[PDB]
Amino acid sequence: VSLIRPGAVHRAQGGYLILDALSLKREGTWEAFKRALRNGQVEPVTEPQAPAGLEVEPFPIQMQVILVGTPEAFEGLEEDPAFSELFRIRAEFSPTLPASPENCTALGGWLLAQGFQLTQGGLTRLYDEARRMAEQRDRMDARLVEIRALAEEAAVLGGGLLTAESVEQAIAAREHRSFLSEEEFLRAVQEGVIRLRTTGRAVGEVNSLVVVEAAPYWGRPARLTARAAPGRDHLISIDREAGLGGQIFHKAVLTLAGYLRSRYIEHGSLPVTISLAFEQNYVSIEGDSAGLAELVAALSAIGNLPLRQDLAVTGAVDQTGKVLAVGAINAKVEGFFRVCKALGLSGTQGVILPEANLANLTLRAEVLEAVRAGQFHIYAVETAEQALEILAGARMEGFRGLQEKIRAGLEAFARLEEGHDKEDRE
């Protein structure tokens, strides 16, 4: 009897047993535990090579099991109906908390309980970085351990005290330690290996903003070229047709094709073939954030409108022609700012982004300082026409307008096609 070693179900009798569902699923113990809970009883495990063991009575289960784990580990575990039969109460954690002074005070108290030495500025900076991680101005990231890790790094750099300077240094060091890929990209851009223009004007070229999926936090521009040729109504996505196309990214191209088909109807099928290429990309494009950039590039190619290369363009767009919100807006804006600063800020560089992402613009200190100084601009748009107007620097309406130029280019391409047909017949 004295050789029975107590287990978790013995030590947690009459109380609570906290288990990890990833661990339960990983070690195959899930089925045995599920049977034990349903039976209400279980015996300590005996090595099968023992002759007969003891006639041990199964130990009663008088505990409350509280399995803790990421949702993936649970939708990977709740497919069995016996799980939902046994574990019926779901305590779900919101990934973000509402950014309020009460929650800032709660975070400060939590960090103080964790043993940190906080100052008001340091706590404020940590709360702002929590909102940064949440990528929303009115929500703070609920991942308290991530904030605690950043607090530890700030304490090391601040000498044990979490001042604002220490937290800023910790964030800067976190960015710098994973900055090698961006450093190489900036070096390539400066060397001219990756040709990017952040000054002047170009026809059919726009600085689209992409996010490096190898580490989904570094944004960087990728200039997009649209070429308009008469003929088939096809809107060729050179990127997607050659693989390199997200499942969602194909939706963006079709949506742009539909918008262009339905918007410009003075002929039958649209008389232009637009080829869109993320050039020098050599990697998969996954999101639809390119929708605004592709749309403005295609419109400029149709109308021979020289777009400003100063401004990067990000944002999805539906076939109504309205710019929709995108994710990782901070990463893209800061990446374009990094590229512009590397090549030298000219006081006119900027980013065109949807108005729906206003609540998601938690920019770095340097970007905000540049914007305040007038060395960097942020343009918020809600329709693709506004983005094209900002890029080409002209209004749609009125004589010599952008819309009139686009219509004239469409007329020219349709005339080229119908002349081809005319000399085909005669």
């Binding site: 803790v68 954690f93 200190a365």
Partner: protein
């Protein structure tokens, strides 16, 4: 529209970054009233609950901190008593009697 710096200034302003703070510890599951209420229901009803949420939320530690403040009735003393040299049974006694 060209966003001004004021429309982009999201950081909460600092005025005294050298003043140490002294704040009371927040309640467990602060800002997580859904999970706290679910755990309260599971505790009152004796149900088996399960905590779900993105990794690194501190769910494991906040759970232990919240359960420590709880107070369940004195569990009966459960122990293994041998009815024979080969058979051992489970014995339940009032708390503090084993």
């Amino acid at each position: 529209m060209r966003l001004s710096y004021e429309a982009l200034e999201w950081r909460t302003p600092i005025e005294n970054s050298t003043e140490p703070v002294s704040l009371p510890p927040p309640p467990p599951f602060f800002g997580q009233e859904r999970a706290r209420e679910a755990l309260e229901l599971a505790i009152r009803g004796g149900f088996h609950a399960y905590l779900v949420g993105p990794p690194s939320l501190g769910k494991h530690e906040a759970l232990l901190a919240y359960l420590s403040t709880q107070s369940v009735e004195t569990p009966p003393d459960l122990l293994y008593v041998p009815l024979s040299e080969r058979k051992v049974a489970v014995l339940t006694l009032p708390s503090g009697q084993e």
